[PDB]
Amino acid sequence: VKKAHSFRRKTRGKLSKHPRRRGLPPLTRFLQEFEVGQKVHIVIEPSYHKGMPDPRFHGRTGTVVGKRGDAYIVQITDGGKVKTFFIHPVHLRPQK
Amino acid sequence: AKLALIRLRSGIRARGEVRDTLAMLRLHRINHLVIVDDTPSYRGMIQKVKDYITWGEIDKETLAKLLRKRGRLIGNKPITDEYVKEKLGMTIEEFAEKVVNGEMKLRDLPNIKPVFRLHPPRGGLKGSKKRSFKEGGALGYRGEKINELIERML
RNA sequence: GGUACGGCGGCCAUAGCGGCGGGGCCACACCCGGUCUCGUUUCGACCCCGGAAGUUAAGCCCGCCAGCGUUCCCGGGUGUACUGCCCUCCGAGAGGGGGCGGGAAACCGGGAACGCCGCCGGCCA
RNA sequence: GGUGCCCUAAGGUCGGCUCAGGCGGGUCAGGAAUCCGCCGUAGAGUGCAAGGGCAAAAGCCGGCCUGACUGGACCCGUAACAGAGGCGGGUCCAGCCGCGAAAGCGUGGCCUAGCGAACCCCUGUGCCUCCCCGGUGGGGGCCAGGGAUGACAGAAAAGCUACCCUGGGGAUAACAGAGUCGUCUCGGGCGAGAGCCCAUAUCGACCCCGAGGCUUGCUACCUCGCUGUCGGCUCUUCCCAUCCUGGCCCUGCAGCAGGGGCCAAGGGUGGGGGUGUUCACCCAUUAAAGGGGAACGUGAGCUGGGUUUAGACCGUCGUGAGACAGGU
RNA sequence: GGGUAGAGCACUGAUUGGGGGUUUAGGGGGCGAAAGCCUCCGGCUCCCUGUCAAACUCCGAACCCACUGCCGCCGUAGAUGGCCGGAGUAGGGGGGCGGUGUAAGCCGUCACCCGAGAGGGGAACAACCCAGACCGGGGUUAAGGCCCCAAAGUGCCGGCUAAGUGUUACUCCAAAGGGUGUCCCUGGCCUUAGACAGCGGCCCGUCGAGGUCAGGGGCCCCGAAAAUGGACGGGGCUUAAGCCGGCCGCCGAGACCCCGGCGCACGGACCGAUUGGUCCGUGAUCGGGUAGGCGGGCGUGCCGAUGGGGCGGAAGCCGGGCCGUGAGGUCCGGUGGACCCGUCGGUAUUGCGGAUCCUGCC
RNA sequence: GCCCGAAAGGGUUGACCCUCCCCGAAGGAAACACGGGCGACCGUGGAGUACGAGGGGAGGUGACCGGGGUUGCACCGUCCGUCUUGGAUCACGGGGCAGGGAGUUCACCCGAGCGGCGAGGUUAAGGGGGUCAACCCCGAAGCCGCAGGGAAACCGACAGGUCC
What we know:
- The structure is cut from a larger assembly and holds chains A and B.
- Chain A is 4% helix and 31% strand.
- Chain A has one helix spanning 27-30; strands at residues 39-42, 61-68, 71-78, 81-87, 92-94.
- By secondary structure, chain B is of the alpha+beta class.
- In chain B, strand 4 (72-73) and strand 5 (77-78) form a beta hairpin.
- The longest helix of chain B has 11 residues, at 60-70.
- The structure holds 4 RNA strands.
- It is classed as ribosome.
């Protein structure tokens, strides 16, 4: 049967943890800062449900083009299209 | 070192990546030969096209013969001792010796075409086009034995 | 310069769990009371308040133990299982073989490991 | 495997605490449970499925509250890449507020299901407007909420045709062909054993390996105005997987006979009764009265009994018109 | 960044047997004076042994994806990209991968081919092998092949097969189980007398030289029955014209090399009544094509202009030549007896093989 | 191979054919002298010679050639149009010949190739003249544009300040 895409479809593994992390992350990640032009990996922490991008884009690398509130504005390319996301720094990781 | 690559097989019934890599190597047609410098970035592409080409390490005398008999300039004009002696200060044997053992690039000749277009081998390929040279066939890595084949194709 | 002293942290088990043995100006705890601050759907036990007669026994500090768990290394297992590309190779078929490239898991034997780093303070002399 | 809900708390926030089970202690029939200690990485619990997440909590126990609000902006998904009305979610700016010592959090439910265009209508709210001008009653417009289309991107909606018609279709059934062989038919391996005793004269379990495409099914490659017909009569030819006729072998072969096997397809294999029958059943003879293939051979060769076109009767079903892979 | 293959039992759930400890959640009885102090078939917690997972994971590839820098390729002869406009396409198939299904098939996926793709081979063959095609010539190779049909070997060396087995890369080939039929590699027990073969009650004289049991491989044999007359493509082939392990020369495409000719694309120079032309340069990186888009040319009837032809014979018709890729143009001869053509610019009932097309003739 | 010819095609101002000299792309021999290999064969030198598409020259000869009709031998070749994944099909249409026979016109909208005027552009109906359906002059009514936003009442802007 045909089934539409939703936020948590086929996310069993990708939004799961190994049972030796299991909880609140350390706080450096919560308190990261970023500059415009910095490349960032999109890596979702499944224990924090605010500022969560669609898991479809988990594993990609984008560029920061600004801030709004505590969230950063990240651009990616999907085909020819450019897409824009508001992501909490906990779901992000810098390149290098 | 300098590697000589000869194209042996058709691209009908090959994958598009293979076709594109051969085009990047300037090996568009059968029985065409290119000279390349040995590096990881070229070795990867060779490994990708391994089943459509032969390759090996070329020698200075064979390179000089090849420059004299099949070397061409823009316009498909042939290369001559006088042209060389003029635009540079060597003979062909000296230029090719250098090119082989470093110290000069082929491109250092103005208006030199990078593709050597050969004729098929005298007496035939002495192996099957469907197999590797090591197991008795024609395809893949030779060594100094690529020079024997070039001479038959020259 | 010293101190078997303490506060705020980082990396989050090579740091844990457990066992053994040692210590007390300063310090850190346990300890006695509860009128008052706060409170016990009953107990001043726990939280809070007031202070030290008194204790090194516990926590804490110090050193050790390879017992459990954890991470790393060398060698075997083994270039084994699996696998990307090509094949007028085999085989009735399934399924296998050859060339060029990648490459485990269990298990076995032998070694390292019973935390590392940052900031400011206190006390003795 | 679940939803088309439920909750003034199961919503917001602050504080404090830690679960299931097991063991050892006591009153108790299974005892549901109340009491004490230890161990104990979550085995518990969470408004609800499944998966994910969570331990000085996102769980338990309490206290104060109503951010389950107003005005607006930009993003993601449904619908990758690659277009979308409506729906859902995210990040913020202001306003007015809640919890809190404060930092902070709060735009319902720890995350992902719980619903819906145009046109018309009802309610709230304050403004614009109605044909020369000005009043009164009434009407129209802008904004917000609500009333439904589950065939859920949304017609207001029951049947028969055998008296049937048109346009088309092998994109799609009946039939011959083609494919396949579960099923079927015909075999085999081993040997449980049965046979006075003796595995294999004869019979051979349960498991395992195959041939054929003449039995039925499966599929949908060919053919929709090629011929669509079953059976019988007539006429020709082919196979052997042999009933009789010729020749042999073993036997639980005395003879007469039987049983089981090998070679062999040159010849034979008939006549009648009831039924449309093929088949099957029966009778008298007979050396025996074998079976299959050839578009289930053979309707530009015959027949037309059967095969529910148009007429008619019975039964049954149906309000009825009518129908019946039922009969006449 | 990711949990597939593989692997394993650390979670969830399945699953054999033993050796022990608590005994009982519980019906059976036994000495059961009665659920009894105590045991029997059974539950709980260990240890050793043996098995599993599409909806399990203490582990964990090959591979794929995004991004950074470099190598390579494309790009000022203007890419990537954006705007405007014109479409066609909504029945796909072969081959490889997955799920389902006895299977044939059904449903998806990759995007090499057929569709829309000539030529050389496989006997003929949509998609299996070689190889992508302007024209005229000369050469070398590919796939495969070399007894005759049929271009090129009755080719060479070592060995196997006796069944016409075979003479089949694929499209288009029957097993479980048996035979030591023959050629080979191994391992144990025998062997100065062993396996029988004879005279007699293990052996003396006997024969005297190798024998016997096990495992393994190569080729073949059995298992193996159908309908018109017949298929390694045919003839036929047996130290092969079959098979295995290797080798040596030849034949064979439109592919590759060379010479000449045509066109296209881009750039440039020059000459022009105006969508142009002659020439030069570059082209290993231009030269197949269905639906479909774009560019330039040929032909037909009438008008405004311009140049012309015709009784010393127009149009039309029959037969022949030359030019032109070509659609077509023009000349010669014959028949005929009154009108016709070229160029520039406009206009249109403007081009037929087919509609079970229409009218007429045969 | 048999047959026929016009002269529009060519040709005695030289058809065809024969021999010799020069240059020659890619490609490329053999005999022969030695040697390697059990052999089928190979290497060396002969030799990049002799040849070789083609590009030029010189002499002997003296009349055809190109073409056309029909036909023999060898090699190759399953008609045309159509839907269809797939056509020589036992899928549909298809005896022969000649003439006929299918993207037209108007109104509105979107674009383009060119041309005229230009902050303005353009006339309609109609009228006047003439050599009278052709030609010349007049005629801006209206339409688009020059300022928009807003349901409506209503309100009502940079003819240039900075940078790449």
